[PDB]
Subunit: 289 residues, 6 copies
């Protein structure tokens, strides 16, 4: 009769909570989720959530155990899983870098000698990076804590996943190359997409809408009509500022416009200097241009 979809959402780690929050904002929040449950209903009667570990999501989606998944690009690439990437989700960004003991000769990938050992949690991506750059080096897979590998003599070099070079400087390591830029993606099974594109695009519009709302707020203010002109030039908004009557002693209007977070501080000072008062910043859940 009517098709259901299952979306694979990380159960633990950094990706998990923001993925739950995004679905919530997309109108597809978790519904009546009992604990000890691997599956959960959502606010949409045709969408369920499967809690899966993040490294398994590429495969679950490739195989069709889940129609859609939310996971990291690094994991998708490492598995080499056969999946369609639908959207970049603009969170969970991290670089898989190649790093060396700061006192090392090696200052760039050109310096890596035949016998060099590299410790990694991502042997697939790392072998591939080495193969593409033609470097002959050995790759040792570790469970974690690659940062310790030079210290204990397992490796000359490491790979590592970071937003800030800080955990690297702390272990006295220097980035000598970036192997991969990673971000969280919404992915899809191909067979699922061809047969269930309505509901899929429905969730995709909801999610895509939340992403376009990022760093966008609705700014409202009361202005005396004599200054309404300078407020136009300051708040162009999406098509133009929305202007409404205010019941007061002066000819006061209320002006609303969607504004980006990059612009709000300079705008506030520019608005106040023109006679704007009662400046409100109201949240926007979804934008569809």
């Amino acid at each position: 009769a009517v098709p259901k979809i299952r979306i694979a959402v990380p159960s633990k780690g950094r990706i998990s909570e923001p993925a739950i929050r995004l679905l919530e904002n997309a109108g597809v929040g978790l519904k009546d989720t009992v604990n000890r449950k691997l599956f959960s209903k959502t606010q949409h009667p045709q969408i369920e959530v499967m809690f899966s570990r993040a490294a398994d999501i590429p495969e679950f989606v490739a195989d069709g155990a889940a129609d859609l998944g939310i996971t990291g690009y690094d994991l998708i690439v490492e598995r080499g899983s056969d999946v369609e990437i639908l959207e970049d989700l603009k969170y969970g960004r991290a670089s898989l870098v190649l790093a060396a003991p700061e006192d090392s000769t090696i200052r760039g990938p050109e310096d890596i000698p035949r016998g060099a050992v590299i410790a990694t949690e991502f042997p697939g991506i790392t072998e591939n990076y080495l193969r593409e750059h033609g470097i002959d080096a050995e790759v040792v897979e570790l469970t974690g804590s690659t940062e310790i590998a030079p210290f204990i003599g397992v490796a000359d070099l490491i790979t590592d996943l970071s937003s800030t070079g800080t955990t690297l400087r702390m272990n006295h390591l220097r980035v000598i190359d970036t192997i991969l830029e990673s971000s969280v993606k919404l992915i899809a099974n191909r067979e699922s997409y061809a047969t269930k594109s309505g509901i899929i695009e429905e969730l995709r519009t909801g999610i895509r809408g939340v992403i376009d709302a990022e760093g966008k707020r609705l700014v409202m203010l009361n202005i005396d009509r004599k200054n309404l002109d300078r407020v136009r030039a300051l708040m162009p908004g999406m098509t133009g500022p929305t202007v409404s009557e205010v019941l007061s002693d002066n000819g006061v209007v209320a002006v609303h416009a969607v504004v980006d977070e990059k612009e709000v501080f300079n705008l506030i000072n520019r608005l106040k200097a023109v006679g704007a008062r009662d400046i409100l910043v109201v949240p926007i859940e979804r934008i569809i241009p």
Copy 2:
């Protein structure tokens, strides 16, 4: 002089966090909550919160240790506590079902023989269900994990609490009846209500308001005036769409209406096809019709 109320809120489990979020949205968020504290102030000077385990809340409220409580209907029924139910809170929904090993003869309650053993966490509800259906069966109370009871030979049948039949299919069990539909309730002591109805109805209005806001968003768009008519028919809203001037090159208006989440996706496509742009979905915390 002036009356204080104490509301019992679950401390752990699935009910806990959403109850805290609901009070927050009702204007009664937790205020300055020190850890290791069994009590907490709220944003309202006359409302305090007592952190109680969910199964104890019916009794705390029945006895008057708490004026009000937020807990599950199953727990209220199981205890048979003497309390007034004020509101259904529309979350934490779950069915207490009667289930059998999938390969069993028993396909419905009619098939249960004299000597049948049923394992449960809810002996009260279960005895009562059996008594009302006239079935002679034995009831064994377990601490948890009733799903394992047939496997280890303790029981022929089990009861279980689920939103999805998934944890049941996983243990190879089939639902042969639904015993009780459960949902989270706001409850009240009777003596508390008669003597403190002002503040109680105040919290009740706040909470009731958050529940009516569920699946309701405020949708805003910019439309060229030539198409303002088709937007009326698409966005009836609560009384009618709110229309405001936009300062642009064309006669553009801005149109706002409260819309239900069931309708937003079809609405978006219907709006875009009519010339609507810059579609915003803004959250609504409380609705009072």
Copy 3:
């Protein structure tokens, strides 16, 4: 070229999460925060977050390891750290009280004898309180659980941090004085402020804006024009209610005003009695008057 700032934010305890939420609401939410990271980027390219324990934040800020910090006033005072207080953050309020075994002679600080022992987690503040009140009493520093100290014979009196006297009454203790009122503060290094005041005031405006939004919501309603006058007197708002056209059968207008949470319940009943319908309470993230 351009200056970066580092803000010290508590990593564990009651202060932590609300501090993260406040920055989020200020437009400076945590960005791409990898776990096991002591530092994190934020939504602002010039602002980073250092996760620090709350008692260490005064010193980190005094010394310049962090430009700014969010921590409790009690901790700032106890350390006696040299820092500039920028804003009170209006959460995490607690009183450091002096308390005695309820059956004790001591009913006020005047009754404390020469040899009296006071157990505390705040010896600095406590010595200082004693020194200012001229009382000769001994101060014993404990790791925690000062509430047990009279019971085991370590102390006659204790200090304690509470929003509610409940944890004190439970251990059968009575407050005999308040030593210090504590609240969460935004603080700053002096050298950081003189050299990086632009970006600092930018974050300060963002944060200050979120604090002024507390207990303030945007209330919207549909009213028939014949009753628009009584709605003026009920919703003065910031300058005056914003009034917009509604496309319906009657001359209906829509009226919006910023209202304080203290007034919403009485307002709702007053609005309904005048013919107001479809009352919406919409959240406001930031107010800049």
Copy 4:
């Protein structure tokens, strides 16, 4: 052919780790546990089922487990038809009836009609009022009965203590003892009559461990001329064991079973009589 037995063991709480340690000491330790739900042991005929202690009385009576290890309080609360085989001499606790210290009630006889008692053991409590002829309500809590008076849920509580210190902190006074609890080894009656051999083998091991508690083997070197005075000082189970030591003098080695209670005084006595090199060596099991 070969009867196998299942023993229900607590999976969490304070009964768990000591019960597991008890089986280990009895020669039937957890073998290659992948803790879990079912574990193998050193004995081919014995398997452990990890269970919630409150459920163990039921699992045993219904036959899902041949044997169990759980608290007497839980056995009585369930009302489960099980055979108590052995007292395990640990997890002792009294289920007491308690009143607020500022209460007039000092004993069962002071409890007025309609008093409310908060408890985790509603079956035990209702029965206690019916054996004593007291007309009072019973209210069941998940835990923290200590806090019920303070919040106004009950006038009285029951609680489970071995030291009255939790009660003393929360300003509560013991007015009676309802039941004395200790961890028991229990048996399914049908399992016993059909598998007595293997049950008795584990029973003996388990009983041997309990009978070794606080017992030590004391060993010392002494010159031959003082051997007569050691004799009196430590009688042991039957008498002290003697062996020749190879050294310069006529040194002998003397060993005996001694109780912890005796050891300090005994050491002093032995030292004053010329004994040196005194060893205390553990005994896992004793069978008299």
Copy 5:
């Protein structure tokens, strides 16, 4: 001068605490651990590096650790060039191939072309299909292979069990055994040829502990006139030890090494022959 050795020990999982207990029993316990990443032991020449069990085979082969303690399954999965020194007789588990119970597949020979097997050991599995000549896909999971058929990720799973009970719960049937696992003590080849003395010293300690498992010293008092029948009843490692007891009769004390398996029957035999005061005393290490 003085060679020092590093032994990689699992920092979490079920291999961890028993390995640490094993070193303690071998006279090389963790000393003043501030557990950590590197710890001192009772032996000046020995230091522990806490490591993830999956990494230990690599740390050992590459030379970052002279010795390790990790599962055979992990050693084979890594394919690490290490020397297995000793079997440690714990953490036994079979890596089995399993099918849904409602599956037609009962054996390796029933596996149809293109069947999908979910596993945590993709190297072991791929090799198993290549030693048996089976054309099937392999899919690697982080864990919970038991759930893969139910969700439709695979037709078959591998799993690691000592009791088939997890499999029985999730309605799965064992169709073959791929590998039998046990915890091993492993060595770097270069470390052995250069530090054999200290390695063999720890090896002996460790081997002595394993050879003591399930062995006890049984001790009893008996009258001299029955000493002949004890002899037959417990042969011990060579024969029972006898010493004079000081009491009233002609009482002697008799001691022997006995296996746990024997102890119950033996106790009965000894009791029927007049032996009393029977003690079971632990043995930490045995070296024949």
Copy 6:
């Protein structure tokens, strides 16, 4: 009548479980603990109060606890007026003064005026600068002093290590040792003069455990004709114990106290001299 004593024991950290194990080995283990705040022990006259290790020095000096078990570093930091009774030979750690590896400072004498030292032991540090005559600031942190230079909070740190490995990871170099720490048994002076009997009884038990560390009872079977060479090979505490074995030849059993350090060499010696069936049996306590 009957004096009772309270002993403050750490409730968490690395001092906790070994202290509890120490009391158990001393014949005064935790009895029926419902861990808690107050526990009973095997001794009627002894009760345990679980406490934070940092508070134990105060609880003892002020008299809330007669005895305690806590780190020397914490005792000195408090400046608490307590009697140290016994060294407990575990939880050893040095409080070191450390500099960034890329620092010019190699010793105390290199520390320039106004240098900032981050520490968890501000009392110990301030005193160290005043015993050495160094003009430097002290900044107190909750923990993670290792990270203070990297973030720019201090030029120097103090830290508490037994292996310099945490320091080596965070690129820090030890420049001096401020204090050497070990876990102590401490006493209230007033408690000692009034309850010396019971205190000394626990002291002896506790001291007996520490003196047993690394000591074992070695036992072996040998033919009578080789008994002379065993004598030389293991002198024991006074000399080896000998008993007749019942077998076919003239076999005797020989036992002695031996140190862990000796055991490997000794085993080899005994094997070469014809000794077989070598047992290592634990000793809980030794009193010379």
